[PDB]
């Protein structure tokens, strides 16, 4: 089963309890959608699971791959 649409998929594989009103709560095994790029080491994405948008560490998110590309 492939996502289908062309976008950006990034998992968390970790439980991060947001500490600030800007941070995003990550959940081990949750699909996140990277929207903007905060900076080297920090990115902005919307948790496709919970539905929250915040800044999470790139180290926590890994760039997935698949037949998406041509």
UniProtKB/Swiss-Prot annotation:
Give the species: Mus musculus (Mouse)
- Intact protein stretch covered? 385 to 441 of 735
Report the locations given in the UniProt record: Nucleus
Locate the SH3 domain: which residues? 8-64
Task: Give the function comment from the record.
Answer: Has E3 ubiquitin-protein ligase activity. Acts as an anti-apoptotic regulator of the JNK pathway by ubiquitinating and promoting the degradation of SH3RF1, a scaffold protein that is required for pro-apoptotic JNK activation. Facilitates TNF-alpha-mediated recruitment of adapter proteins TRADD and RIPK1 to TNFRSF1A and regulates PAK4 protein stability via inhibition of its ubiquitin-mediated proteasomal degradation. Inhibits PPP1CA phosphatase activity.
Write the protein's name.
Answer: E3 ubiquitin-protein ligase SH3RF2
Q: What is known of its domains?
A: The RING finger domain is required for ubiquitin ligase activity and autoubiquitination.
Q: How is it modified after translation?
A: Autoubiquitinated.
Q: Where is this region: Interaction with PAK4?
A: 8-64
Quaternary structure (record)? Interacts with FASLG and PPP1CA. Interacts with PAK4 and TNFRSF1A. Interacts with DLK1, MAP3K10, MAPK8IP1/JIP1, MAPK8IP2/JIP2 and MAPK8IP3/JIP3. Interacts with RAC1 (both active GTP- or inactive GDP-bound forms).
| Family statement | Belongs to the SH3RF family.
């Amino acid at each position: 089963g492939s996502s289908g649409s062309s976008g950006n998929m990034f998992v968390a594989l970790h439980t991060y309890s947001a500490h600030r009103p800007e941070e995003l709560d990550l959940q081990k095994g949750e699909g996140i959608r990277v929207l903007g790029k905060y900076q080297d080491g920090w990115l902005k994405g919307l948790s496709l699971l919970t539905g929250r948008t915040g800044i999470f560490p790139s180290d926590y998110v890994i760039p997935v791959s698949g037949p998406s590309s041509g």
